[PDB]
């Protein structure tokens, strides 16, 4: 409770902040896809013993090739659908035509990235080059770095010429459709010009592209820091010293740091489907499936001692109503209910368990114990067993690390949730 | 005045027809972007004379490069913007998540169009294939006779799985941004399981693919058709008898052909800015600049007349309320406001003078009299006179063929406008 007038300002100048809230938000409108993507991903790549010729006799030889058409419409895909969202949604929050400006931001995306891709001779300094191509790749994870900033530049510059009033002023007797496409046409132009001239800006730089000297200077860096160890921590630490505070530090932080924990994730994802070793421990199904296992706590092993050990009536039932989101990784139930929320001594199981519980992830990845994340995407509300095994691209390297955490919060919470059961069970027989 | 109970009732219902509907409002979301695309176009190819050399001496002898990619943009991403736009509206339509159906309708489309472009060297097999890569001819105006059929078919699909709650239902204390996610996720995945399926059927075919079954059948051969002399007189016959029962005829017709009128008016940009001679005479600008001139039906003739020869108090005034916005092709004021929307006087050349401008056109530019459209582009609301220029391209046999036109118009209309101006007057004085 204590330390509020430190974290709790800060925590909600962030939350409110209209651009991290933009992207934040717009990139929920990838979710769905990177999943389903992900259903195609892992029923082609799945390592079962009679699988790999299963599936060969009843379709044919090139049975893994359609299975991987989806993944290529979902995944090459995502910082195209994230450039809609984003821009569209900054486009609502200004109070302006969210369709003009998710649509404006789609073609100036494409504006800003070449149609064409070059093939080089080995060490010749000759080639030969492929037009009216979309570089399919600049479309996927590597992209959304700059599908932010070009869909931010746009929207926002958008907004504030339709504010500005700069626009054709259409007849009232005019249909309404005819109203609202001409509105866009003059701050849509200006858009595209603008964007345009800072295309061919770096055009004439070192780097060639937007997309590159965005990519050289920031895309990349951060990817650094973000598979760090350090990068890890300090994400998890903040995650829950907001939750502390009743925010929703998963989608806070998750919405900062996703367009980096996707970049990583999708790497591990493209070397997995091609039977090679998967580079990165740290993508978003890290945290997701070894880290926030019942929720945002290792809540789960907690709900559990409550289920086990919980004399009082008080949490005896809140874990009996509680395993339930809690099997699937929600748990507003617990950390509000309990409550966990600026709980003195409750909090600090909450926010410890986590931090070792991504050391020891973290490490058993590395020491080669246990398997890296395929990089198929496996949405964050999966049972913990199924979740481990799936999300290792089929490795049981994987679920040995959950039973392994599962049973290190299991013991680090029972004794903090012993203190709370006994001060429960005092005033539930009114005591004062 | 009468023989509408036949047609009166036939537009009606095909006018609140929810898929020609979903089309006809989805593509209007292309449409400020060509107008944008076009301004790029129509600089980069200006045949002014000092002017190609000029501009290559300011930035470079490589300048129409750069004007060439405001164009990619935006003409080259017809498709890919028309598919957000109808599978929206669409979704709009029936009440469901549009941003939902809009993103999924465009991530169904990149699924059904293959990441694949696959180059022949002539004659001996020899090939170089390559992959990562979206085909950009096939987000251009070659697809949007597949955008609406997979936006229909996938947004149709869509409605309805939601409509039967096969949705699924997350805990009532999750975000709303949570619950609105896995409300998509079945629908959304059993829809894409569906249009791949659609794929690995006709990649099985003579066809190859979805891109392909589709253009043979269906755009090659109603391309024909509206580039036919009959296709640009049922479709500008259908418009104004649609006018004489006050139904918006342009936005009708337009908005259920336009998806053949805007491929010949690619396929007039392909050649131009390759300096070819330039194929089709029918596109969507042979229409808008110079039959459409004032509006409706060569409106801006029959304004100018009542400017000039206003007998009676009325048509004096209503003349000098809309030259104003005559000049810029709207016509509201005239066809409603003199009533020639239901009146059998004026109605007689209302409808004659378009048909009969549109053969003065359809030959004066297959005559090669005249320049066909360079297929840039350029807004209906353009004034008259430049209109017939930029439109061909900055020819001067357009600008031309409006004097000859509007010419031509003023003296079809001048005897029904005396006519009607006769009888105002009298019921002006107190006559008969
Ligand atoms: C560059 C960005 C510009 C793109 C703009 C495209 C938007 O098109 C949109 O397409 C929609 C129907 O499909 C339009 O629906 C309307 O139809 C009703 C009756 O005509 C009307 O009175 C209502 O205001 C409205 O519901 C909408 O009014 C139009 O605006
Ligand atoms: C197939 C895949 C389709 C998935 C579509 C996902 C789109 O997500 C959508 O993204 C929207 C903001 O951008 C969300 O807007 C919210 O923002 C408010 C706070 O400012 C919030 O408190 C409101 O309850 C809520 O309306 C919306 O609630 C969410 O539902
Ligand atoms: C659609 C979406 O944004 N999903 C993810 C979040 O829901 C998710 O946070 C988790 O949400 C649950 C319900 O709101 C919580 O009970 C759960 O505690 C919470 N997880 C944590 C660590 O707080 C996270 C998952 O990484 O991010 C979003 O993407
Ligand atoms: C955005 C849009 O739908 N534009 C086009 C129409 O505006 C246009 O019709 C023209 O619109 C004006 C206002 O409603 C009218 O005054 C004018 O008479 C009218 N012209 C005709 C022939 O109806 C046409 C142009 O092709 O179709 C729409 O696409
Ligand atoms: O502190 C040593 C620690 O690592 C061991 O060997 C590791 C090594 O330390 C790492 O550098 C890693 O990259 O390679 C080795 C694993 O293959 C042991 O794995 C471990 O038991 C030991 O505690
Ligand atoms: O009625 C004759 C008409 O055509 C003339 O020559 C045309 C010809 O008719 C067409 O077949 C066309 O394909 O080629 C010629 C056009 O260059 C004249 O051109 C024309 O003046 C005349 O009215």
Redesign the pocket.
Known sequence: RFLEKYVMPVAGKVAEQRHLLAIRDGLVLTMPFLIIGSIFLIISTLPIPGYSEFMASLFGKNWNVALGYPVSATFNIMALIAVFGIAYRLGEYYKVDALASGALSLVTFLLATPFQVAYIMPGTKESILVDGVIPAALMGSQGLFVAMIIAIISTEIYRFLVQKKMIIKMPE???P??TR?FAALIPGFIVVTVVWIIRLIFEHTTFGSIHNVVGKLLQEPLSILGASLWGAVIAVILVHVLWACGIHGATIVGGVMSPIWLSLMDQNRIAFQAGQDVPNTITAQFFDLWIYMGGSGATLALVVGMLLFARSQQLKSLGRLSIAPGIFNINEMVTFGMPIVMNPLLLIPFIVVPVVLTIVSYFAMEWGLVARPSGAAVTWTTPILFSGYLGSGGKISGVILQLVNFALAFVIYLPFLKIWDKQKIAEEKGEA
Do not use: D
């Open positions: 007797t005019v249909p459709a005819v496409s």
